[PDB]
Amino acid sequence: EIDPKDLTFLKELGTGQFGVVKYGKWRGQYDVAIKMIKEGSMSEDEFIEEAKVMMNLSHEKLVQLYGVCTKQRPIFIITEYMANGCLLNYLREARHAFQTQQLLEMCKDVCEAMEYLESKQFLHRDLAARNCLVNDQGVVKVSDFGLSRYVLDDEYTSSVGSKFPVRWSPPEVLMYSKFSSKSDIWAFGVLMWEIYSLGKMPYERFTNSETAEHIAQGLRLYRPHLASAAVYTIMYSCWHEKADERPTFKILLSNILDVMDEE
Numbered sequence: 001e002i003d004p005k006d007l008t009f010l011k012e013l014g015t016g017q018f019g020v021v022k023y024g025k026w027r028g029q030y031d032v033a034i035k036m037i038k039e040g041s042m043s044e045d046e047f048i049e050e051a052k053v054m055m056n057l058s059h060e061k062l063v064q065l066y067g068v069c070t071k072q073r074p075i076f077i078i079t080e081y082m083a084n085g086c087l088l089n090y091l092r093e094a095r096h097a098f099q100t101q102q103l104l105e106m107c108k109d110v111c112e113a114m115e116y117l118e119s120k121q122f123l124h125r126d127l128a129a130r131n132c133l134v135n136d137q138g139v140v141k142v143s144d145f146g147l148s149r150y151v152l153d154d155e156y157t158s159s160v161g162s163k164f165p166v167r168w169s170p171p172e173v174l175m176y177s178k179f180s181s182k183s184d185i186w187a188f189g190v191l192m193w194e195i196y197s198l199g200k201m202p203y204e205r206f207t208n209s210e211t212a213e214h215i216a217q218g219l220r221l222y223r224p225h226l227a228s229a230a231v232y233t234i235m236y237s238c239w240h241e242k243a244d245e246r247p248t249f250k251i252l253l254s255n256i257l258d259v260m261d262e263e
C-alpha cells in the first residue's frame with residue numbers, strides 16, 4: 001500500500017480499459033505510471049485481494065508493480081514507468097528501421113516474461129503487442145497480465161463483444177471459453193506475427209467474425225516477409241488446432257535462442 005502523499009502527477013499517458021493513466025514521481029525520485037481506476041470499470045474488491053498475489057510476481061521482463069492506493073476512490077495502481085510506450089505503436093514507427101535480430105529480441109523479452117508467468121501458473125489472457133511496453137533501453141515488458149479478470153465492461157469480457165481480443169484467441173476460447181496456458185501460447189504466436197509484421201493488425205483484411213471462421217477451418221496467419229522459415233515455424237507451432245500439441249513457453253524460449261544462434 002503506497003501513501004498517495006508520496007505521489008505527484010506530472011503528465012497524462014493516455015487512457016486504457018480502467019480509465020486515465022498518468023506519469024509521475026514516487027517519493028520525489030522514482031518515475032512511475034499511475035492508473036487512476038475509473039468508477040464502475042473494475043471489480044475493485046476482488047482486485048484488491050489479488051493485488052497481494054500480484055505483488056509477488058517479479059521478473060525483469062514483466063512491468064513491475066510498485067504498489068496500490070486503496071484507502072480512497074478512485075484507487076491507484078502504481079507501476080514501473082516505460083518511456084517508449086506500447087509495443088504496437090513502437091513497431092509501427094518506420095524510423096526505428098529495425099533489424100530482424102532486434103525483432104527476435106523483442107519476442108525473446110516477451111517469451112521470458114511468459115515463461116515466468118507459466119512457471120507461476122498465472123495466465124495473462126490478453127497477451128498482444130498493445131499490452132506490452134518498451135522502456136528507454138528498448139527492452140519489451142509484458143503489461144496488465146491477469147487484470148482482464150476484473151474488467152466490468154461486457155463488450156470486453158464477452159467472446160462476441162466489440163473489445164474482446166478475438167484475433168489473439170485460439171478456437172477453443174472463442175467456441176467454448178476454454179482458457180488455459182495454451183491460450184496464452186496461441187496469443188504469443190500472434191504477438192510474434194505482430195512484431196515481424198511491424199505492427200499490422202492480424203488478419204488485416206478480415207473482420208473478427210471472419211477471423212474466428214478462418215481459424216476454425218485450420219487456416220492461419222501467413223508468414224511475414226521479415227520472418228525466416230525458422231521464425232515462422234516457431235509462431236506457427238503456437239497455433240496447433242490441438243491445444244495439447246502447442247509448445248510451452250520454456251520450449252518456445254529454447255526455440256527462439258536456437259534461432260538467434262543460427263541466424
Ligand SMILES: CNC(=O)Nc1cc(-c2cccc(-n3cnc4cc(C(C)(C)C)ccc4c3=O)c2C)cn(C)c1=O
Nearest residue numbers: 013014015016017021033081082083085126144147148
Ligand atoms: C510514453 N510511455 C508510456 O505511455 N508508458 C506507459 C503507458 C501505460 C499505459 C497508458 C495508457 C493505457 C494503458 N493501458 C493499456 N491497456 C490496458 C489493458 C488492460 C486490460 C485489462 C484490458 C488488459 C487494462 C489496463 C490497460 C491500460 O492501463 C497503459 C498500460 C502504462 N505504463 C506503465 C507506461 O509506462
